[PDB]
Amino acid sequence: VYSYTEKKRIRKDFGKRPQVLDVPYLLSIQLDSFQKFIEQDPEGQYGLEAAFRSVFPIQSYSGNSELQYVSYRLGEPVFDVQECQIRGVTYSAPLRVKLRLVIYEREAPEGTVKDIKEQEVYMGEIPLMTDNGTFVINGTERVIVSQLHRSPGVFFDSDKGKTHSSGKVLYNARIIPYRGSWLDFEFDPKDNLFVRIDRRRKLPATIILRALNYTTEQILDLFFEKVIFEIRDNKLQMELVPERLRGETASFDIEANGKVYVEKGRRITARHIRQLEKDDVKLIEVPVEYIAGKVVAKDYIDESTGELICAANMELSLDLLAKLSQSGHKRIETLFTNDLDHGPYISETLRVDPTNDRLSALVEIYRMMRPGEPPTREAAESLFENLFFSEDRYDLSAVGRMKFNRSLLREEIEGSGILSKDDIIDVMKKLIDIRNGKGEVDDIDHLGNRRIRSVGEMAENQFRVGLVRVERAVKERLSLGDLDTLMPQDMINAKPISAAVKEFFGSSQLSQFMDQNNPLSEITHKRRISALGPGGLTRERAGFEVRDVHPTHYGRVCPIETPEGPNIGLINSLSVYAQTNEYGFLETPYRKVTDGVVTDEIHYLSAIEEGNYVIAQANSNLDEEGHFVEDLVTCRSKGESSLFSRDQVDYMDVSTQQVVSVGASLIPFLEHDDANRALMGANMQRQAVPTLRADKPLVGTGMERAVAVDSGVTAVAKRGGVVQYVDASRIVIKVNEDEMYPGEAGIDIYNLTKYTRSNQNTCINQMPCVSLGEPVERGDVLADGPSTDLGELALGQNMRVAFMPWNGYNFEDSILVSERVVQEDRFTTIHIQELACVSRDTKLGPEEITADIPNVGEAALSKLDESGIVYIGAEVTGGDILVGKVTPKGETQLTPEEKLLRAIFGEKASDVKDSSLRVPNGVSGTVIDVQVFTRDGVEKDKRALEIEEMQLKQAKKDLSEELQILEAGLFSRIRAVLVAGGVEAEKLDKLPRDRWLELGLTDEEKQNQLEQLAEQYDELKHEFEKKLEAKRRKITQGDDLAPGVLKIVKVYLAVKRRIQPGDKMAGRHGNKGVISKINPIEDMPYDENGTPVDIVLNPLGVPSRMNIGQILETHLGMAAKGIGDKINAMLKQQQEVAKLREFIQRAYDLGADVRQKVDLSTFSDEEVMRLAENLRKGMPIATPVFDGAKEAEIKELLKLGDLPTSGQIRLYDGRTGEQFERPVTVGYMYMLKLNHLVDDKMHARSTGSYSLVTQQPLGGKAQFGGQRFGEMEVWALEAYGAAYTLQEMLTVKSDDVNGRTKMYKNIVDGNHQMEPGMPESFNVLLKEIRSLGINIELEDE
Amino acid sequence: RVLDATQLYLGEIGYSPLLTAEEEVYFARRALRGDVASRRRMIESNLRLVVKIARRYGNRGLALLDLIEEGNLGLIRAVEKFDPERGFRFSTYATWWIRQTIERAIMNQTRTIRLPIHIVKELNVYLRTARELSHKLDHEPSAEEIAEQLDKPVDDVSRMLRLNERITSVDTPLGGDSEKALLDILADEKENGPEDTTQDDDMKQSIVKWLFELNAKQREVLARRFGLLGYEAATLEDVGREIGLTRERVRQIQVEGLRRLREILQTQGLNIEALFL
Amino acid sequence: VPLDGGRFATSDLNDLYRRVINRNNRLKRLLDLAAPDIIVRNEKRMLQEAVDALLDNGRRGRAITGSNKRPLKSLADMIKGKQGRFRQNLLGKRVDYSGRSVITVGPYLRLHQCGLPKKMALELFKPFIYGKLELRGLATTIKAAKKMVEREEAVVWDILDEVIREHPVLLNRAPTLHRLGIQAFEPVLIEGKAIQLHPLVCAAYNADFDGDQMAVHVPLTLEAQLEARALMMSTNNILSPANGEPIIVPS
Amino acid sequence: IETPITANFREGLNVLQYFISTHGARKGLADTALKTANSGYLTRRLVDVA
DNA sequence: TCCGCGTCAGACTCGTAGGATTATAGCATACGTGA
DNA sequence: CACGTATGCTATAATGTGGCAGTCTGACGCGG
Ligand SMILES: Nc1nc2c(ncn2[C@@H]2O[C@H](COP(=O)(O)OP(=O)(O)OP(=O)(O)O)[C@@H](O)[C@H]2O)c(=O)[nH]1
């Protein structure tokens, strides 16, 4: 059972592990997230609903007036993506919000029966996400990257030494909300508990409890256990709990009843404990000297005097015991604090605490955050309550409360966003438990603590900021104004919200130009996770621990895809099967193992859930429809891996691929490649420029088709059916009746995008895949995008490669290519550049775009037409004028020379300059397209007007063909309904179709169908009219441009770039190179058959690199092509369909334990010859990642091609004709031409413009810049002798203004003398130091 | 540890007397007659009023303290021109003056380039109009749409919105992080490149050699006219001041010098070669 | 200065000077007006704050944020930082007669030679061409010589070939860790946009041809030419400055 | 790690051997980006002194 | 003398792309330079 | 005189301020 597009070309699968779950939609994250932000939910606070209900209702400071939110609505987008991209506007929907101004009486208590004013106000346009996952901001496609941050909740951490060479581990708790101040608890070397509010100055931890109204005795009752001391007759007694002692050393002789259990000075073992407990020991007699040091719990006072004998939390003595006895207390509650397990921490912290009561504590807290400002009681209560106990300033979020409650071992997940008094104490308790030794520290790098924020959350937050800015303005105006005249819209401003959101989608670090070199680049960019940007890490902040791959990354984050750079480890590609849980943690699919039998039941487990179960490896061998073959299965739990029995196994990896990301999944023999090289391989696949002919990969994996389809760059069929009309522009498909809805006409139109500019100025072209009259199913590829073959992803071109030295032409990774590659225009690449010419209005007057340009050759003006615009199709080269522009010049004063010169030619040319847009120097191309943007009032150019004529007539044609094909398709259905119960075949075709409004049949369901088709026909008739009026308005509409700008002309140049020495090429195993030479065909090593090799790569760039994948790819590539050469030979000689069928079935069903079965037979003869015609240019094979082809399978395939098992061949030198002295490995490596063309990088400068202040030459090729001669480069000249070279570089080559011109004149005069001066940078330095008020003088000779 | 200029000043203000109605009247009568202490006490007691309006005037141009100081200038003028004879209270009158002086300072010091309040006031109405248009037109105001609503010239609306453009920082970088500053992209234009400067040195040098190649009387009236050799660039009629003293003979001899020099450029290899330039 | 867009762009020193002048002049005013001393004090605090921001912003506590939120760059900030003026504009500079491109092998080269692209060399030796053009009398003047180069006339190539003869060029690769990161070569004009490097010196540069680039620099003076040929030439720097063992060796 | 990687690059490492390799690899690459700068800072301190 | 905020550091060239925001009332009397 | 630019004046009472830094890190001093 294969699909139509797979029947055309089947990939041979060497995979053996049956896929229980297919690769999901790869662009799920971006769409789900943003969809939640705009999604209208009544209850579920997501995006805007949440944002309004959070801020609103806003009530005035006086309390008479309030503004309340009803609902919102997005207007439809003013401009489509197309018009937005051309015009350079943001693709957005207007946000209209219903708001009700309600007013209370001040005279009545809370009478709401005064004024309720309800109206729908505009608050900004929100940018919309495309179906693909992108935003178009100012006519540029951008992607907003998902973010990775610390999940709100609690974290228990510890400086492992660091502070105090004492080497003390100081434990700390950090409570992190989603919004609010941070609450820190920490230990000090002296074991005193401290609180830092908002990581400010230190305060004793007990002070925060006093602020929450805790008496001293209540604090101690919270943290400490109580031990009762009875004073009987004369001897001291204390209530014993059998265990408490436990692992202590007995300080006194412990006697129970009359009989001695412990010996004094011996350690109490388990036997003593169980003996005492079983004897039921409750009193033990003790010496008075043991209480010296015990801490009293409660306040004990003299019932006689009524004064405090001892305060709570006070260290007891022999005399305080005596005083207590004689007062009349024969029971003393004392704290339990035995070092080791129960530490007296809070006891010692109370002694450090300078505060006494609640108020004194609140004052001290107030004085910390606001130091200097006098306390008031109202102020201190307000501040403390507004810190962690205000619903508006503090919000843990659902995820914060949930992680918080699980960390404190609660049962309830959901709860309050504000901190309870219980919460804080539980946190302190756990901190202290961890200090004692029971309980452990949480991991910050653990994915269970790193959460994903995609777009919608971030758009939501910026939108809340906008609302908050608005709330101040609104509340301010509600209080000041009269309430009754004043409506809500005079108070609201749209510009703050629009500005907050504009700044996110445009200025933000996470919003960046889509990387559109190729489909994979796009797809991988949209599934990026960044720990950087706002609310995240910085490069400065980022350590070594965060960057390294943790064990939790398994199945969630790619371990082998990260920028090799400063961003190494902060930016991460998402894994294949990975997804975001409801709270935003990453989760991975796993197959449930029940009673040892491995079900197809699939569970997504979060980072925290995963730790708990034992998960078998994917490669673990299952036994035919039940349990594991092997007794001891290789599994992983508790973040570590080993053998387990079958009964212990809980779960198993879904696919072998789930560990890896998308990009790395496309690398064939990843298993045989070093992880470093593999990283750069996956990174360079993103840099691959699509060639003129998109060639499939012979050695693929299978992700090829998934990526091409999910990227969206391919047109895929929604409805299917049969293709009515193909064209190099459009595909119209007639839908099948089973999916075709009976309401609208069942004809799908896919318009293909023709040769369009990318962000990297690469070429985006869609070509039709299917032929005229081809039957297709839902989800079949109808048209190929730029770097896609029949449905599969095709990043570059496979080539006959031989590993062997040439005459140093492949020295260090240098590549030797055959001329045949250039001839066949393989790796010829298409680039479309956009140049704009802006007509501005200046103080002197408006700039003119005339062809009438002072001082210009007829050669130049030949190419410009009447208006001053170059013609479509015109080839241009550097310095040719594209759009002629002249600027009004004010002062006309001339140097005497210019007076003479202007007198000689008499070409006074009034007083206009030349500011024409001309082709940049050294770029040369053909003009493919021209666009003109004019304002409204100003008279249109002749050329602008003919452009509008074309767009108008073309619009008319487009809409006319819509109504025509839609009416033909609609009456074609009426014709079939009328035949149903009314045979009039030939009789209905003869009378005109235009006079079919009269035609009906008897009143049944079929008469109602005729009514549906008739109402649709007329609906389309008026729809066509209003569509055409819209188009006509937009074409006539004068576009609002920047202030100053009258009109803009955009020229699009096209360039065909040939492969050439200096160009950068790589494979998919991170094997790069620069092309050194293009060898004539004659010269290249050739086979016994006479066929020359395409590329000669250096053997020495393999064993050091340890990317052995490229060699396996080459052997299999040759085997693939071996079988393609057999099929090519059988197709050239026609032969039998039976014989082709035989060979091809034996081929597909080769592999030792091939998962993929192909029972050829069912294929019809016509399907088989279309299939062979595609297999002829090499049978495409798929080697999954970690479940790839084995050596023995590759050699078996080679034998089927009659190629050698070694995959080494005899080669002959093209030059000499003699044979090479040993066999050479030859085969097909799929190669990529990266974006790094020498054409773009070569730059040179003699003299140019110079910097403003420093007077040094500028930097960069775009600014025609000199190369930077850095400190490092200077030192080199210092080490040498070279003093004159250095001075040159410092002076006449850089700042020295007089010197550089003087030495230029000398070099043209041929004097080659320096005449140095003083660098202007130094003159500046002096002026900058004197501006500081330091006298710095040059002291003369 | 009170180090902040703001918190120090606000501490000093709180430490003042708050005035009543009859007290304002007593002090105000003494103040206008010219009391030292009365002026000081009325000002110091009403500083809190400045702050309450100064706190609601931040995040627009200057800082809180900056606005507080200019607001205080309004308080002084308010005490000088307060009328205690009118039954109506001081706080009401002072609020006007404090808002006036703050607004005026915010209109001047903020805009880097000194702008007139006349253009600023016009701008205000253009912006308010834009706000009302934006609420009903879901899009944003065009210059033409605003101009239609005020019944004013499109050109005048465009000139105004052209003065609204804020100034960008050159010291501030653009290239993602700190890779290059706007200063280092932007070249000195008034300054010619050494190639252009050297080209002028060659023309000027050539002229000296070209002057000693034509007639002695053909380069005595051709250069003393253009100001090539002479001190002042004269005209056909003004060459008569020297020795020429003619109108016809000067015009024949100027052009006779240029015609022989045109053949000197056709033969050396320029003429149409140096015509494009 | 005016940007092309009609907008202006200015230094932050202007914003700091304007702070200082506004508050100073306001202080003059409040002294003329005999203001009560609390207000005089506030203005004197604000004046010292503004001057201290102008000299060294950020030292006196919280730096004054301008337009973005970034602290205004003050006088001291233009001198101090690595980026100040010392490290950036004075202990190293951007340089005339400098170019760069991708490097590629030149196994055919001798040790003292390097492949220099035609169009790159045309541009770097522009004044030297202008000079020979005028001595041959092929160019009447400099602007005609410039237009002959722009047209890239066949005679110009022959002159350029003549200038480059025996003229050494400096090749530099980042990073320049030790002195052999700069070496002089005699250039060989080549058709094509890539620089050709001799294999045996790839060791000193740590040059591998998987896309590395190199800076080219032209020693202009006779003295600089001689220092390049004698001291900095590839052939003459065979032994390393660190150990006696040489670096020039094929692999 | 207590369990070594008995399989090589020719035979093909398992998903777990590859994942475990990653750690060392990436720490190597991060080392080149980050550690280069202390080395270079030492060069510059040395140069200034001599 | 020692615990501790404070202050100073953190390879070299190449690239890409341009850039933002807010609002300050209506009116008359006034001072300054060119015709 | 006039256009552009500036200073001016108004009267219910109102009278103490408040948006972030996210803990980089080893190093080496300068007050209590
Ligand atoms: N200067 C500098 N060099 C880098 C950077 N990243 C990679 N490299 C260099 O890139 C080169 C990449 O590998 P090679 O130079 O080919 O490594 P190798 O020492 O030749 O060893 P093999 O790969 O086994 O042949 C190394 O010399 C690195 O020094 C960087 O950020 N700066």
Ligand SMILES: [Mg+2]
């Ligand atoms: Mg190497």
